[PDB]
């Protein structure tokens, strides 16, 4: 919106937002030590957050890493950021990005692959899901995209507090991690759609479907996508394939042919239930081993809102 955006920490801390942030942070968590300790003096704590963010005195409390959780003030500060910072980033997200965008969501992603699998009758498909998206987001070339849109010195500082501008690891477990991961992988969206003039694709954070009406082209696109996201974005590509549309696009929990869409969702349910059980088994320490495992394989099926799902059902 007019490039710039050089005055957002004013809107992030504009109560009216720090309350939207509050109601967004508390939504679902109204049973979290964090909400309930915050809810007590909630609007005094929002006025002290309006004040700690307006004055840039805000410090993100240490991530409680079991999935790194935060505080309620922290998730509120992120909800405040990603109420002003999210809509200036999820505006530059090519429509075919489908993660952490309420409008263009999971289902619209599976619908979209199908859509532009139907139209153009794609003869071929590229899945190019990213490896450690969150654990290998440059958190540095991320902040060369969270800085070409923010341009607000103090928002940029709040972003850099809520998410340090140094490392290689967006903390999966944050709303700003969600947003910035979409933004970050939006660089590969803008190496698909902009460069690579690939008009037909879809992405949810790490999963990058790129349905293209020619095979070897989609393998080129992928190599170009991997070379980009490695050299520019330090995102190793865990799995990829250039399959004829017939193998099915294992995108976003579905297997999306032009015509049918066989929900393969099982890894998720297996993991959900596994986490589930582990917790109502007192085995929340081998769950960290399992979690680390599943955070390696089919977490590059962007099932992190599910990881936070099961960060909340169970601990």
């Amino acid at each position: 919106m007019g490039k710039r955006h050089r005055n957002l920490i004013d809107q992030i801390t504009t109560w009216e937002n720090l309350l939207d942030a509050y109601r967004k942070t508390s939504h679902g968590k109204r049973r979290t030590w964090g909400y309930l300790e915050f809810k007590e003096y909630d609007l005094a704590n929002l006025l002290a957050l309006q004040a700690e963010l307006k004055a840039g005195n805000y410090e993100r409390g240490p991530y409680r890493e079991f999935i790194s959780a935060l505080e309620f003030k922290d998730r509120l500060v992120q909800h405040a950021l990603c109420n002003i910072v999210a809509p200036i980033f999820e505006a530059g997200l090519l429509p075919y990005t489908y993660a952490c965008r309420p409008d263009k969501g999971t289902h619209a992603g599976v619908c979209h692959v199908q859509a532009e699998l139907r139209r153009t009758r794609a003869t071929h498909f590229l899945k190019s899901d990213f490896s450690k998206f969150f654990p290998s987001i440059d958190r540095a070339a991320l902040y060369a995209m969270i800085d070409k849109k923010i341009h607000c010195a103090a928002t940029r500082r709040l972003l850099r507090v809520v998410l340090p501008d140094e490392g290689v690891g967006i903390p999966i477990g944050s709303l700003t991690s969600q947003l910035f991961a979409n933004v970050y992988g939006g660089a590969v969206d803008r190496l698909l759609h902009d460069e690579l003039k690939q008009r037909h694709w879809a992405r949810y954070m790490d999963d990058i479907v790129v349905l293209g009406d020619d095979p070897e082209e989609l393998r080129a696109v992928f190599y170009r996508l991997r070379d980009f996201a490695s050299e520019r974005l330090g995102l190793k590509i865990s799995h990829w394939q250039v399959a004829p549309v017939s193998r099915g696009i294992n995108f976003l929990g579905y297997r999306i042919w032009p015509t049918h869409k066989l929900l393969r969702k099982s890894s998720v349910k297996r993991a959900k239930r596994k986490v589930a059980n582990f917790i109502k088994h007192g085995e929340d320490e081998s769950l960290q081993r399992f979690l680390a495992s599943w955070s390696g394989h089919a977490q590059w099926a962007d099932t992190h809102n599910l990881f936070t799902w099961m960060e909340e059902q169970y601990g």
């Binding site: 049973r31 964090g34 300790e37 809810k39 005094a44 704590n45 002290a48 003030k73």
Partner: protein, 122 residues
């Protein structure tokens, strides 16, 4: 920022209160629809409905299980007040739906109170 620390931070009281605030938020509108008449029972319902928060809150800022059991007794009296508001308040006070809804919310607070009573008893 640091959330303004109340003392004796008790999850159960906070949760039970936050979950009981949903009971109030449901039952208070339908106490405040109880006719011009029936208003002393509504005084006492509300004093029972809105005043059960104090019971939970003092229970959380107590270590006394007496106060936890007193919070349970109040929830049971509120569970009663549902019965009364439904049946005995002769106009209506509480529709079976409203009771069916309110009893669900009070049951949620009942669960949290039970868990809270349990965790202290050990």
């Amino acid at each position: 920022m640091e959330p303004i620390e109340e003392a004796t931070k008790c999850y159960d009281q906070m949760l039970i209160v936050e979950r009981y605030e949903r009971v109030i938020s449901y039952l208070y509108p339908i106490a405040q629809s109880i006719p011009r008449k029936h208003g002393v029972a509504r005084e006492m319902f509300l004093k029972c409905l809105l005043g059960q928060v104090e019971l939970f809150i003092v229970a959380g800022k107590s270590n006394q299980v007496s106060k936890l059991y007193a919070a349970d007794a109040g929830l049971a009296m509120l569970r009663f007040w549902l019965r009364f508001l439904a049946g005995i308040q002769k106009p209506h006070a509480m529709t079976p739906h409203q009771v069916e809804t309110a009893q669900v919310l009070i049951a949620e607070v009942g669960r949290i109170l039970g868990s809270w009573i349990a965790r202290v008893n050990r």
